[PDB]
Amino acid sequence: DAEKTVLEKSKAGAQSRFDSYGKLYDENINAGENQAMTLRASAAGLTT
Amino acid sequence: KMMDALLQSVSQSQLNADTVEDAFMSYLTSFEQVANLKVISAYHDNINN
Amino acid sequence: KMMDALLQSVSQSQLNADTVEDAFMSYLTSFEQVANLKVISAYHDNINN
Amino acid sequence: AVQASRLAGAAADLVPNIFGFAGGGSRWGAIAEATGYVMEFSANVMNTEADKISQSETYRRRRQEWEIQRNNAEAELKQIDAQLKSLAVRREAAVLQK
Structure with a gap:
């Protein structure tokens, strides 16, 4: 029974790692990262 | 365009009272500059008003 | 050369309607500028036409 | 600030600067020069600002x-801790085997 507790409560750690990485994947680019993209690209249009 | 200046100016990790106050002051400066201008002349694109 | 301007301008991670619209507008500006030019003079490289 | 400074210098440049028997001397291009300086400065400041944002996203x-x-x-x-609990049992069962 104690070995079972060891297994399932290590599984809770694996679940926290899996869902945290999925939360990092689905929102790969946030509102700040693309703001830099738009700001950097706006500088390219001043050559003409 | 000045609200787009505002958003990218205020978008950062650390926000403090002084930073947002200064950003609002710059935005208000832009708004005041674009509001004080006066019209000189105009043209009407169509034959009929 | 303007299609090479176009490709590297549109190549990025995030593509939106406004970004591609503006890129097309810049490309069309380049095309219009290179299309309105007029010939002045010419030379023929060979003795026979 | 740089935009105001360059525009002020441009406006102050169109007035003539030589007088008497020779006149003029006003550089006609000064407004286009000021618009060029401010518009090339704009690119540098937007690069600095985007780099501040990218630093912020990095720290996050x-x-x-x-x-x-x-x-x-x-x-x-x-x-x-649960591994220790299991070993505590295993040791109680070993004392009992003794």
């Missing part, structure tokens, strides 16, 4: 990776 991503590491360490710590 790093902090999230410290959540991944801290949670992994906490889970390993938590599983060790």
Whole structure:
């Protein structure tokens, strides 16, 4: 029974790692990262 | 365009009272500059008003 | 050369309607500028036409 | 500030600067020069600003990776205590075998 507790409560750690990485994947680019993209690209249009 | 200046100016990790106050002051400066201008002349694109 | 301007301008991670619209507008500006030019003079490289 | 400074210098440049028998001397291009300086400065300031933003997003991503590491360490710590509980049983059963 104690070995079972060891297994399932290590599984809770694996679940926290899996869902945290999925939360990092689905929102790969946030509102700040693309703001830099738009700001950097706006500088390219001043050559003409 | 000045609200787009505002958003990218205020978008950062650390926000403090002084930073947002200064950003609002710059935005208000832009708004005041674009509001004080006066019209000189105009043209009407169509034959009929 | 303007299609090479176009490709590297549109190549990025995030593509939106406004970004591609503006890129097309810049490309069309380049095309219009290179299309309105007029010939002045010419030379023929060979003795026979 | 630079835009106002360059526009002020441009406006102050169109007035003539030689007088008497020779006149003029006003550089006609000064407004286009000021518009060029301010419009090339704009690109540099937008690059600086975008680099500040990218630094901010970097520090945030790093902090999230410290959540991944801290949670992994906490889970390993938590599983060790139950391992100790199991060994405590195994030892009680070994005293009983004695």
